[PDB]
Design a protein that fits this description.
Organism: Homo sapiens (Human)
Helix content: under 10%
Protein name: T-cell surface glycoprotein CD4
Order of helices and strands: EEEEEEHEEEEEEEEE
Structural class: mainly beta
Largest sheet: 8 strands, mixed
Radius of gyration: 20 Å
Strand content: over 45%
Keywords: immunoglobulin fold, transmembrane, glycoprotein, T-cell, MHC, lipoprotein, T-cell surface glycoprotein
PDB class: t-cell surface glycoprotein
Distance between the termini: 49 Å
Subcellular location: Cell membrane
Length: about 180
């Protein structure tokens, strides 16, 4: 079904919009029928999930038939296919959380090599396309490198992973010491 990409450490909001008469009974569950949250009358209730203290919704939206599932401080283990059920209507949203890190000092000496590491959820195979501060571009799957670093390559870069038509931007400031 629908796929949503989120960033490690960020917040993502998965959507759930009804159709039938406005606002009713609802709940979100992960792949294996483990309730994450839902309503108790006019209120929210969080089940004791592995995400409780980072899972939430937006009560005001419920009246407009919208029951979102917001997860903060995302871990890549949060990738799963989540399920929203409103009355009888059911919906699925696969969340793929990615990370794009750099162990290469971040402040490098000219002629050095930087290496970026895309951290993906199990099974995930995407693609990373970093545009340097000067239009040059690299590409990879889990790692990308530029082994001949210029000073003028200092600044922000734009790495963008892809998975299922959707994509996320990942900006990093590369500092080049002369």
């Amino acid at each position: 079904k629908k796929v949503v990409l989120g960033k490690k450490g960020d917040t993502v909001e998965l959507t759930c919009t009804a159709s039938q008469k406005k606002s009713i009974q609802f709940h979100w569950k992960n792949s294996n029928q483990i309730k994450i949250l839902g309503n108790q009358g006019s209120f929210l209730t969080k089940s004791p999930s592995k995400l409780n203290d980072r899972a939430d919704s937006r009560r005001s939206l419920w009246d407009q038939g919208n029951f979102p599932l917001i997860i903060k401080n995302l871990k890549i283990e949060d990738s799963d296919t989540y399920i929203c059920e409103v009355e009888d209507q059911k919906e699925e949203v696969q969340l793929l959380v990615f990370g794009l890190t750099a162990n290469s000092d971040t402040h490098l000496l000219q002629g050095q090599s930087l290496t970026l590491t895309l951290e993906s959820p199990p099974g995930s195979s995407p693609s990373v396309q970093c545009r340097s501060p000067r239009g040059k571009n690299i590409q990879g799957g889990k790692t990308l490198s530029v082994s001949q670093l210029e000073l003028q390559d200092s600044g922000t870069w734009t790495c963008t992973v892809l998975q299922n038509q959707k994509k996320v931007e990942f900006k990093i400031d590369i500092v080049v010491l002369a």
